[PDB]
Amino acid sequence: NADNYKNVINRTGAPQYMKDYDYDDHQRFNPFFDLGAWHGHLLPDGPNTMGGFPGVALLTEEYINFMASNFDRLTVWQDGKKVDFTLEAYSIPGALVQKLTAKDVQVEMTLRFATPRTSLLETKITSNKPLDLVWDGELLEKLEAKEGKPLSDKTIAGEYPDYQRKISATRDGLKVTFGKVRATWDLLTSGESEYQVHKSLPVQTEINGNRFTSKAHINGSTTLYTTYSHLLTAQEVSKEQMQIRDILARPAFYLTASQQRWEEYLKKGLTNPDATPEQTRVAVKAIETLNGNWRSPGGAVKFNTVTPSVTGRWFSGNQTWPWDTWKQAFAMAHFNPDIAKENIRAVFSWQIQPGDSVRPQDVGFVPDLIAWNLSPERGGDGGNWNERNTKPSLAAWSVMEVYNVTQDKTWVAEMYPKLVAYHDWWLRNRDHNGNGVPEYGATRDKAHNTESGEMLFTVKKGDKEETQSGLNNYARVVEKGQYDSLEIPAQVAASWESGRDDAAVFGFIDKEQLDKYVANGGKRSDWTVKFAENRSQDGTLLGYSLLQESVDQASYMYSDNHYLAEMATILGKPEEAKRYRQLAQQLADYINTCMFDPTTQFYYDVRIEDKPLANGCAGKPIVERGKGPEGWSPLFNGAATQANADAVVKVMLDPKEFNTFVPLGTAALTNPAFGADIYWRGRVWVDQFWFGLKGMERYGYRDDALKLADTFFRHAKGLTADGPIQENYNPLTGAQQGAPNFSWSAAHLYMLYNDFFRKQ
Numbered sequence: 001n002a003d004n005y006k007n008v009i010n011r012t013g014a015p016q017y018m019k020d021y022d023y024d025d026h027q028r029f030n031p032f033f034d035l036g037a038w039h040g041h042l043l044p045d046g047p048n049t050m051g052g053f054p055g056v057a058l059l060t061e062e063y064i065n066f067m068a069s070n071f072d073r074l075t076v077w078q079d080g081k082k083v084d085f086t087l088e089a090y091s092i093p094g095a096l097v098q099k100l101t102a103k104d105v106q107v108e109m110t111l112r113f114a115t116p117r118t119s120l121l122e123t124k125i126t127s128n129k130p131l132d133l134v135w136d137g138e139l140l141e142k143l144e145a146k147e148g149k150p151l152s153d154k155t156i157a158g159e160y161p162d163y164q165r166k167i168s169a170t171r172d173g174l175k176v177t178f179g180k181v182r183a184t185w186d187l188l189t190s191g192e193s194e195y196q197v198h199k200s201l202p203v204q205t206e207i208n209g210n211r212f213t214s215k216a217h218i219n220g221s222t223t224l225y226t227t228y229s230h231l232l233t234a235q236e237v238s239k240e241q242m243q244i245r246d247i248l249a250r251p252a253f254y255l256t257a258s259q260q261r262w263e264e265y266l267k268k269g270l271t272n273p274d275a276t277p278e279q280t281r282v283a284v285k286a287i288e289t290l291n292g293n294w295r296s297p298g299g300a301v302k303f304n305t306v307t308p309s310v311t312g313r314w315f316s317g318n319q320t321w322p323w324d325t326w327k328q329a330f331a332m333a334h335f336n337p338d339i340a341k342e343n344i345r346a347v348f349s350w351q352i353q354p355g356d357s358v359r360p361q362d363v364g365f366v367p368d369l370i371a372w373n374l375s376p377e378r379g380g381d382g383g384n385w386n387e388r389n390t391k392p393s394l395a396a397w398s399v400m401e402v403y404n405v406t407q408d409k410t411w412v413a414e415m416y417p418k419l420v421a422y423h424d425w426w427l428r429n430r431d432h433n434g435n436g437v438p439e440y441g442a443t444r445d446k447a448h449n450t451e452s453g454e455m456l457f458t459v460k461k462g463d464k465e466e467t468q469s470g471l472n473n474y475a476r477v478v479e480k481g482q483y484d485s486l487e488i489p490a491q492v493a494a495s496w497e498s499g500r501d502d503a504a505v506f507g508f509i510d511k512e513q514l515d516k517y518v519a520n521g522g523k524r525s526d527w528t529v530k531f532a533e534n535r536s537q538d539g540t541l542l543g544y545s546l547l548q549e550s551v552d553q554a555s556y557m558y559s560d561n562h563y564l565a566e567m568a569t570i571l572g573k574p575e576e577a578k579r580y581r582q583l584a585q586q587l588a589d590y591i592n593t594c595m596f597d598p599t600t601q602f603y604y605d606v607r608i609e610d611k612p613l614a615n616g617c618a619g620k621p622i623v624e625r626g627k628g629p630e631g632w633s634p635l636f637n638g639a640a641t642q643a644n645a646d647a648v649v650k651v652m653l654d655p656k657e658f659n660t661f662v663p664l665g666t667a668a669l670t671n672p673a674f675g676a677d678i679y680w681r682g683r684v685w686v687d688q689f690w691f692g693l694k695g696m697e698r699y700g701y702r703d704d705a706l707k708l709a710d711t712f713f714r715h716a717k718g719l720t721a722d723g724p725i726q727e728n729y730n731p732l733t734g735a736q737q738g739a740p741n742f743s744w745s746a747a748h749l750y751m752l753y754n755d756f757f758r759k760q
């Protein structure tokens, strides 16, 4: 089956820089990774790289960095003359293949992964006469480029003097060793990491600086085996040796194991018999993408996980977020459920437990960002590890989907208490006014407050700054309004917690847009989101909330309660199920009463006003900031009444609001802060699009969802081509932007293939 899907993504390339970046700093080639391994390979691009799989990509703990262009590249010699081959090279799901053809000599190479640290190359040489084999390679020298244009003349060795890359011969191949580099934002090595090449036949290896040549003579047709391993610690180096020996003793078993594992992914995954071949191929792209972003345990992360992009500037190594994980695992449930389960475990594996040394006030909290290296507060030197905030919770929805596919009640039993603790955390730490309806917010953290717990902020006016602290001081400053801007680290973290960093609803609007809004009769203070601290009975600082209750947030809490009730029932906990159903109903009632605006036929966030409205709502819907995809969150999550859903769908299907060339973007065309190139104020993301279609379908509009899905399929640029999957689209043009090989796009593209794409 895998052979029906050649070169779904262009995996050719010959990188020339360690950071061989696209215009947004992501690696501009798409290496093949499998089995959660920490290195990847590219296909040759023609004569310069033919005979090898160039572009060894190393996942150095938290980043992707190229090691070499040619490395272990084969040329074949006959009586001193190089054999002249033609090249065929292609990817399939789970393998890279290249075939070199001459009249009297042929070479067939197959590269698959064998372990979570090791790939295996079969080199089959067919020849009527003896031959001399030569393998060569060279470490990269140049540091960084942007779309082929050097960003400087810096070298790798110049930029990282301690990297100290060294190639050495070994008895059965060679190795590259690396010194310890703790470049927090660029390059992270233990000082014990290595890249090893082991072969099934003796070779004589000569090293000259950062290049090597290995030589062997064969008397005729021979098949050899080579392992490549990136090993990140001394312990990994030691453990892998026995695995390498087993692979070389049974190479055909490892090739077969990979073949079979990939046939199973395709069998389990490709279940839409009404899909066109083009639609099916998109599903295969998504499967290749998600599986390549899977990482085996490493460092502080004791589980397999999936990152947002193995090639991403800030998304690589094993960096894991909850938001991305819920979407990832929902999709992967349908083809790689073992890793879907692991990805969810990874996120909860650092869930705050009672007596925590850093944040005992946050029991049940799930960190925003976990990775190889712990934060300094937890004894590591990682700069990415983040506990300033979490992300919106679709955790129960994700856990349920894995159950829906596997029917494994022990999985539900495993996750239920963790889901409950998270649920409880939202109600203690993200409900400033105690009404059962959460806000996005932030934690107590060294970035947010002084040693004594005073909230940090910086008041900016002209070129003058003023770093102050304390909530009451902040409150005065907002009241007086004599500043150009206010930077509150905790409120920045609250924007991160929402998952939509620059959305209109959270008060983000550029100067020109705001000047227009004000010039058309609005007040600039309409765009000010007030902020508050959350304290326990005894005065303890629990964290912070926006003084605003978000309709997507409320709808995800509805969802959380809804799925918990279903899991409670599955687990024979009927009184717990009853309580969750009651909490869901209350949230639905609040969403429909408080957050729906009849006049504009849509849902919106509400402010937490100084006093609640007479009807008990915390504030009026914030209609003046315009419409966004949060407006269909009550439909996606099932909190909406039919009547309110009918009203919302009419707005979604209006070309003057959301029914754009690529439909269901992150702000309506009528939103005062709309821009077609603004990530969270116009651009279309596949998750929000799919949430929209699902919400429509849920309320009787399957036929219209199917039509929007066809529109997306026809207008979303690049969908049927061989480029990597990116993050979002211009709603007016269909143009793509974002990190290549982006997991949650892949996940929702997969869902669309499963749920909505079909032959017309």
Ligand SMILES: OC[C@H]1O[C@H](O)[C@H](O)[C@@H](O)[C@@H]1O
Pocket (backbone or CB within 6 Å): 003, 092, 095, 097, 108, 110, 259
């Ligand atoms: O399994 C990977 C490859 O192995 C062999 O080279 C087959 O000839 C080829 O059809 C296949 O794609």
Ligand SMILES: OC[C@H]1O[C@H](O)[C@H](O)[C@@H](O)[C@@H]1O
Pocket (backbone or CB within 6 Å): 304, 337, 338, 339, 341, 342
């Ligand atoms: O998630 C199911 C299984 O997936 C992977 O194989 C893990 O290595 C294993 O520990 C886990 O139990």
Ligand SMILES: OC[C@H]1O[C@H](O)[C@H](O)[C@@H](O)[C@@H]1O
Pocket (backbone or CB within 6 Å): 349, 350, 351, 352, 353, 354, 356, 357
């Ligand atoms: O699981 C690793 C760690 O996760 C969280 O930080 C918990 O609060 C802590 O108790 C636990 O040791």
Ligand SMILES: OC[C@H]1O[C@H](O)[C@H](O)[C@@H](O)[C@@H]1O
Pocket (backbone or CB within 6 Å): 369, 383, 384, 385, 386, 387, 388, 447
């Ligand atoms: O909280 C620690 C870190 O978390 C995240 O990785 C943020 O991107 C970074 O700005 C912050 O310093």
Ligand SMILES: OC[C@H]1O[C@H](O)[C@H](O)[C@@H](O)[C@@H]1O
Pocket (backbone or CB within 6 Å): 321, 368, 369, 386, 495, 496, 497, 499, 501
């Ligand atoms: O640097 C900003 C980014 O830092 C972290 O990755 C946060 O999880 C993300 O929400 C934020 O956009």
Ligand SMILES: [Ca+2]
Pocket (backbone or CB within 6 Å): 430, 431, 432, 433, 434, 435, 436, 437, 438, 439, 549
């Ligand atoms: Ca509240």
